[PDB]
Scaffold this active site. Structure first.
Site, PDB file in Angstrom:
ATOM      1  N   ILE A 299       0.831  -1.200   0.000  1.00  0.00           N
ATOM      2  CA  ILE A 299       0.000   0.000   0.000  1.00  0.00           C
ATOM      3  C   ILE A 299       0.872   1.258   0.000  1.00  0.00           C
ATOM      4  CG2 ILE A 299      -1.435   1.467   1.482  1.00  0.00           C
ATOM      5  CD1 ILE A 299      -3.153  -0.630   0.143  1.00  0.00           C
TER       6      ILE A 299
ATOM      7  N   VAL B 207       2.738   1.639  -3.424  1.00  0.00           N
ATOM      8  CA  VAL B 207       1.892   2.097  -4.525  1.00  0.00           C
ATOM      9  C   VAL B 207       1.463   3.552  -4.306  1.00  0.00           C
ATOM     10  CG1 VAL B 207      -0.393   1.801  -5.597  1.00  0.00           C
ATOM     11  CG2 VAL B 207       1.084  -0.203  -5.203  1.00  0.00           C
ATOM     12  N   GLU B 208       1.177   3.904  -3.061  1.00  0.00           N
ATOM     13  CA  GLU B 208       0.709   5.255  -2.774  1.00  0.00           C
ATOM     14  C   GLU B 208       1.743   6.375  -2.872  1.00  0.00           C
ATOM     15  OE1 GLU B 208      -2.325   6.363  -2.376  1.00  0.00           O
ATOM     16  OE2 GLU B 208      -3.353   4.427  -2.420  1.00  0.00           O
ATOM     17  N   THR B 209       2.940   6.151  -2.323  1.00  0.00           N
ATOM     18  CA  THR B 209       3.949   7.208  -2.289  1.00  0.00           C
ATOM     19  C   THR B 209       5.378   6.733  -2.507  1.00  0.00           C
ATOM     20  OG1 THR B 209       4.317   6.994   0.126  1.00  0.00           O
ATOM     21  CG2 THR B 209       2.531   8.447  -0.561  1.00  0.00           C
TER      22      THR B 209
ATOM     23  N   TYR C 283      -5.483  -1.721  -9.053  1.00  0.00           N
ATOM     24  CA  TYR C 283      -4.829  -1.182  -7.864  1.00  0.00           C
ATOM     25  C   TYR C 283      -4.588  -2.273  -6.817  1.00  0.00           C
ATOM     26  CZ  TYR C 283      -4.209   1.369  -3.460  1.00  0.00           C
ATOM     27  OH  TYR C 283      -3.697   1.819  -2.265  1.00  0.00           O
TER      28      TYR C 283
END
Ligand code: NA
Length: 312
Positions: free
Chosen positions: A109, A112-114, A295
């Site tokens: 998570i 993928v996010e930052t 995602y």
């Protein structure tokens, strides 16, 4: 000394003659004890961003999944993922013990996010939320709630609201939490008494809590790849079929499904054809973070790739 400025009833800036901004100020003063002039000073500095509005409006087999996957699963990303996992191994283990959410999921998570804190957003949260709350009727109610919570968050964590940056939609920190997620799911996992979305330990615990709150079942399978093709049945993370129906459609699971009696039918475009999967509850839980089959599969597989790269 003390300047009440009761007569300074008209703020300047991009939201100067905006009724929505005025109503919002009234709500904050009435409901949360904010001071009108103090809030007017903050909002007079808030910017109406055209880009934020354009982006919110903007939202075979040809190898679709392959293209999406390679945006996240690369040697550089997997290698940086290993570095993050090792660096925060104690926090990740503690999150597993407390929330039942495995390190590969949390690492996936945040990756993928930052990219583990490397790309956390460059837009002032205040500008994004004010823009969406005051100049975007379609989702004004949702965003006004986010702005309300953001201002309360800044007040409580003692942050200057104008100094915080994030996404074009107001998402923040390592896990790109929206203000409402901070309110309902963020936790002080570092133990310092504060909840900092930019602190990796707090972010790890917060992502874990978000997952448990959305139904993550500790130790349960995420998804199981299927042998066969099911072209006649609609697919996607929102679909739901009994194992019996999936069998009648021509599918067999590559791994035993245990006691699962239903599953979503996921279909990934791998170029040479389609790869079908039995989506289990935990897969749907990942989509609760971002409503997308691609995602959730990228989050899961990135985490798996990092777990393997750590073993070597
Ligand atoms: Na903390």
């Amino acid at each position: 000394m003390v300047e009440p400025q009761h007569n300074v009833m008209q703020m300047g800036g991009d939201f100067a003659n905006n009724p929505n901004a005025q109503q919002f100020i009234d709500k904050m003063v009435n409901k949360h004890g904010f001071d009108r002039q103090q809030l007017q000073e903050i909002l007079s500095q808030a910017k109406r961003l055209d880009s934020v509005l354009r982006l919110m409006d903007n939202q075979g087999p040809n190898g679709a999944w392959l293209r999406y996957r390679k945006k996240f699963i690369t040697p550089d990303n997997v290698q940086n993922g290993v570095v993050f996992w090792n660096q925060y191994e104690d926090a990740l283990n503690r999150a597993w013990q407390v929330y039942g959410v495995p390190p590969e999921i949390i690492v996936g998570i945040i990756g993928v996010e930052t990219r583990w804190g490397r790309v956390m957003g460059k837009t002032r949260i205040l500008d994004a939320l004010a823009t969406l709350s005051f100049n975007y009727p379609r989702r004004a109610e949702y965003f006004s709630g986010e702005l309300e919570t953001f201002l309360l968050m800044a007040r409580d964590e003692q942050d200057d609201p104008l100094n915080l940056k994030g996404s074009f939609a107001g998402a923040m920190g390592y896990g790109q939490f929206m203000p409402s997620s901070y309110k309902q799911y963020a936790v002080d996992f570092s133990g310092d008494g504060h909840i900092n979305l930019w602190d990796p330990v707090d972010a790890i615990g917060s992502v874990a809590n978000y997952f448990k709150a959305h139904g993550w079942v500790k130790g349960d399978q995420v998804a199981v790849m299927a042998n066969g093709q099911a072209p006649g049945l609609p697919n996607g993370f929102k679909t739901k079929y009994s194992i019996s129906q999936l069998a009648a459609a021509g599918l067999t699971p590559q791994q035993p499904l245990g006691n699962h009696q239903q599953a979503s039918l996921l279909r990934l475009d791998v170029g040479t054809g389609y790869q079908y999967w039995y989506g289990l509850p935990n897969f749907y839980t990942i989509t609760r973070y971002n409503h997308s089959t691609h995602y959730a599969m990228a989050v899961w597989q990135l985490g798996q790739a990092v777990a393997l790269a750590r073993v070597q």
